[PDB]
């Protein structure tokens, strides 16, 4: 009777404390899963933003690089000022991109990398080692160490 | 007196003089909550419209120009202060709104023929943070911890307690700002020591010398500069940039407003940049319009120039520290730790000055912007609430699949007495033998992590692939004893495996 | 002493049962709050990026508005191409903004409301209803109902008479 009461109380206490510990352990694992899910959602949103954002920088860079530096003179005050403003806006755009992890890709004279570079064409070049970039057609971008868009680049072939 | 049966969440509200903050103890670390507009800070401004409204926060700063005689900003300078006091007498001239005398001789504020005490303004701001905390929590919060400056009297502490109580919030305990900073920096679980708290960056500068004897913090001396803060650094940089631009071209942006705003924001960005980078540049295309055309600003700013601009301000943080050391009756060798709080305690010149003044390298293990709120949340969680129970895994376990994928049957951070079950199908049609391989690791490849054991389940009725079901149940029990077994409903023939000791070669193999 | 020890044990059992129920309620609350946080981080999460690029968009708009619209001729063939490139870039950036919920706030004649508009001056304007916004100095932005940058307006004021 009373002797069995102590045994049953000890068993009930052990079961209740173990169930409490398991309930508390579920909260921590659920919290970690929630943090992972929130971070993954943030990453997906930022990636979706950057993928559409790259085209603005590409178009602006093409527009500014269209004009050569020979005719940018003080006798054309409406063109030198605009060119300077556009170059500074490009610098600002690149600064904001690299501030939020969006890294540019300008591998001039670097070793060819299939993951980070796209081989537009193969052409031997004198004085340059094969498999090394000789020119860059389009500048790619990298986000947090992953290639968001490979750079369309040329690879020196063997002559 | 028995247990209080809190059954609620305690939030630590940092009722600041300009910018407030609310933080809660999510699990093992204090988490600062963000308001509706996504910011981590609610400005302590309360304004009332002509008919009736209670715009608090950014919607109260934004409309300040159209409502200049009703917006109450930085009312923490009038809490618990009698009307016939030197501080209120000096303050009344500057504030556009009317500070009036109350019946009980208290400095109150006026709005559209209705009397508000300085406690009630803080009560409204506390209601705002209560809403922004209930939004995150989901359920209402009743008990809270609100922090006050270390120089507050007992009357001001009572006034802040009343302000907390008015906003449907049973204030748990009123804490000191230096004590909350020490709690956030983690000096609560430390032996007897003497520390100093460097609070620079807000609207005011304050230095307080503490003492951690017997695990309880006792304030020894408090001092600081009334008219010094983090706004002066930005103003100095802004004025230098404006003067440099005027010298370079000939247009002063002081008469401009949009250009001034752009320059101010760029100055803030560069100042925040001139703490981990030696050199910075400021680009602001199309800053101003002139008859000759647009004008662009392009300044190259180095760390040395910035240090030389604000050297006087940092120099001004030297006499109060020495006076606080003198009144605390401790020399530069007694101080065993230095606590850095505030936004302006990040530039290396300030840290060098602090080290020179105290002789110790300052502790920068916690973001100084939100240390007071984090400490308040930690103290509120520890004092009341079942959080200290949760206060008290480099590898995981998996199995082998037909495709070789290292399926994660059990999680990594899981308690030992946990039982989980999973069902799996056969490999191919006509298969009669099912083999399960046990391994430990975190990479998604069974053979690339470890190789512990292998047991084969023999005997299943013939069936097309995908129809047979085999249930894998893990019965790890007690502490360190692992039970791995597979159950199938076809034939009553299972297999066992030991896997009692794993990961014996704990070395850089994972790395 | 055994009787009071067993009474204390039973009280502890009741307390731990209540605490277990509290833990179950807490994990349910965590599930709901996690769902809400995941949804919010799905919607927002480009807040810092957009708040940074607002100035690039403003600069491009100012560049489109600053050329005097008279020297874009065949006498200046290279200036014309640069202006066309700038216009195309501005249009593309405004197309990217609109896709991700960015809606420029341009209350030309709407009613002032502090939740979205930041007042810059209180100049009275004759012929305009009091409480409306006279002009928009800078077009603010907002995404999914969250005002990233307020539109800097000038609110009209009732006449002194």
Author numbering:
A (entry chain C): 59 to 217
B (entry chain A): 46 to 437, 441 to 559
C (entry chain B): 59 to 219
Sentences from the paper on this structure:
In human mitochondria, mitochondrial Hsp70 (mortalin) and the nucleotide exchange factor (GrpEL1) work synergistically to stabilize proteins, assemble protein complexes, and facilitate protein import. In bacteria, mitochondria, and chloroplasts, the GrpE-family of NEFs interacts with substrate-bound Hsp70 to facilitate ADP and protein substrate release. Herein, we present structures of full-length human mortalin in a nucleotide-free and substrate-bound state in complex with full-length GrpEL1. To stabilize the complex for structural analysis, we introduced a point mutation, R126W, into mortalin (mortalinR126W) that is associated with EVEN-PLUS syndrome and has been shown to reduce mortalin’s ATPase activity and conformational flexibility.
Thus, we mutated Y173 in GrpEL1 to an alanine (GrpEL1Y173A) and performed cryoEM analysis on a mortalinR126W-GrpEL1Y173A complex. Our cryoEM analysis of mortalinR126W-GrpEL1Y173A yielded two distinct populations differentiated by the presence or lack of density for the SBDα lid. We term these structures mortalinR126W-GrpEL1Y173A and mortalinR126W-GrpEL1Y173A−lid. Overall, these structures closely resemble our mortalinR126W-GrpEL1WT structure and are similarly nucleotide-free. In our mortalinR126W-GrpEL1Y173A−lid structure, we discern diminished EM density for the IDL region and density only for the SBDβ subdomain. Importantly, we are unable to identify EM density of bound substrate that is observed in our other mortalinR126W-GrpEL1 structures. Considering density for the SBDα subdomain is also absent in the mortalinR126W-GrpEL1Y173A−lid structure, we hypothesize that this complex harbors a disordered SBDα subdomain and may represent a post-substrate release state. Finally, the lack of SBDα density in our mortalinR126W-GrpEL1Y173A−lid structure suggests flexibility of the SBDα lid, especially in the absence of substrate.
